[PDB]
Subunit: 247 residues, 3 copies
Amino acid sequence: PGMLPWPKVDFSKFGEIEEVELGRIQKISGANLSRNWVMIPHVTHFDKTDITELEAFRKQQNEEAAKRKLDVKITPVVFIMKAVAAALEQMPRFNSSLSEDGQRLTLKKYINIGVAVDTPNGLVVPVFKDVNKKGIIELSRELMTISKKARDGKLTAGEMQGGCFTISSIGGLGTTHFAPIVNAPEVAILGVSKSAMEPVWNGKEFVPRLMLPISLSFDHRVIDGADGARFITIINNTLSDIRRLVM
Amino acid sequence: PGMLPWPKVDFSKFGEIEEVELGRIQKISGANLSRNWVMIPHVTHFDKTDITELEAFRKQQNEEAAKRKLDVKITPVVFIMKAVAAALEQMPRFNSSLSEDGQRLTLKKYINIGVAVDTPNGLVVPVFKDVNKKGIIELSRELMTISKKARDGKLTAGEMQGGCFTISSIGGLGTTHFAPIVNAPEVAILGVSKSAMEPVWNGKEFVPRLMLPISLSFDHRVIDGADGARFITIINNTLSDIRRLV
Amino acid sequence: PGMLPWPKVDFSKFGEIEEVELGRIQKISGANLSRNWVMIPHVTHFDKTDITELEAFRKQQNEEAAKRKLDVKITPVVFIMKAVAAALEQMPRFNSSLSEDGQRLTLKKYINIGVAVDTPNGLVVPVFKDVNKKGIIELSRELMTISKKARDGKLTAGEMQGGCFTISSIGGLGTTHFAPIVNAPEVAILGVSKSAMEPVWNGKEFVPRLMLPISLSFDHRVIDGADGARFITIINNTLSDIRRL
């Protein structure tokens, strides 16, 4: 509009350089991000959830699947998808998309969750259908299947759409927290960082508990701060108690 | 300008949908927020303040107001208001507004603070006048009244303006920290998250202390990083030491 | 465009005011920030690094130069400079700049790092050249000189040009973490907050360790989430395993 333009400077004046044309994909990504960033007023909430019992449960279930030879591995991100899916039911406004002119809100009745997955071509986001209607075992098989397909790059565009919400877990690579960008036309995204044993006050003394840090970036046009806090809390509570497993 | 449009998707290829029009109030706020988001380069500072003594002082104070029947609950946010007000005097540049062209900064000598209150239609921000000249009892009394007014939706436009700074306390609902958006034409906003008992090093051992996490988002055109850190430290030091309060 | 204008309010209605015109510098940096904020999709990563051994080594080195009277104070930010420079080597894509149209990426082979320094007129960012080639003692002396120069306001043009990466350490003044704005045309910026002794699990008990909080904002058009995590982890690992030097 009436602002300063990009800073054009001769980099060779300082030393050797090398210029590279981005891939066509990297360009599309960059274009979507520039739009998302400018159009969506971002607010990020941070939180930590006690997954001590979730972890013991996950290992317990993997053992049971091992003795009867099921060839299925339950990763912790499966429980995160389920916790998110449950939360989208209780707070339907997070399961939505805002119109282009920002006038109308489309409330989605179906629950599909995109999960960021690392490929040699950087992160991509496959979408899992009806997370709310599928069990841990079935989702784990899907995640397993989609994983290798992801790392090979044999991915169809059709598999990468229909998302209502995104989960990005980068804790395996690091960070204690992060502030992600919302994936339009979705209205929110959950970030997951590395877990760690922490001293938690029980009322008389500190006790070691396995804490999982999470973050929630949301479109502030659609969601207000109070509703954001209620949402990340529900996810917290759900993850810190796996009685949701016994339907 | 020359960027991609909002994605168009036929959402019904996926399942049942329901399109709904936003409320009048909602379109206005989201329109304010879009402007605030792009015209204000945001920096967010995070911090934690030891409120162990403040909590004991607060429960002591209104158990005596109960003894004299003053009909007033002292909420924690009242103390945060005073701490912010005191910090605004010590660093006047935080109590200001940038002109549209960004050449002129208006330093305000008055101190009014907007505080976010939850209502049936979401958070609203009523403004409290001369926070630096009012006592804990008076502010708490206004707070009870104005919050009650806000929930019924009877708030007046005059009670919604004159703001110099904004406080948003959502810790009663959750989060350990958050990064809020500045409410133009203001310059800074303070967020308050949920408190927790945490192990704090005393020099020889860890001891349990009640820690309140706070956050400060500010207009980086007006405020640089060092002053932002100095500002949140003052708020921290004021809340962690009730002497500075009185 | 199709957006609200800046709010228009007469503030004298509410009480005493005083309008002040910004200095030229303040106007200039504010204009830069407004563009950077809008043109760069920001993502901020957070982390903590165990600097217990670094701090013990740093104090040993200072006490040595002290008795020899060599006039050199090693500050923690010098180690961070070395850690970042090293990371810039391992992950060259952070050592770069994106074109105005966002189609071309300029990979640099030189490593210059700007470090935020406080002055009577606020923070300024003088650039230190060839950090990957220079030692800790040498950088410490450079830092002392340029810092005194900045506080006196005698920094040349060239002394503040050529940066590839910015480090802003405000931990001496406060904060437990913060999310800074990328200094275009750079691609990332590292913030450093106040260190504190924290309990750390060793497998059977909590032991006290000195933890330094760091944060990383970056141009998400160039850097994705995974590589952002890898980058901040390298700096973390380098700072916690001082042996690596």
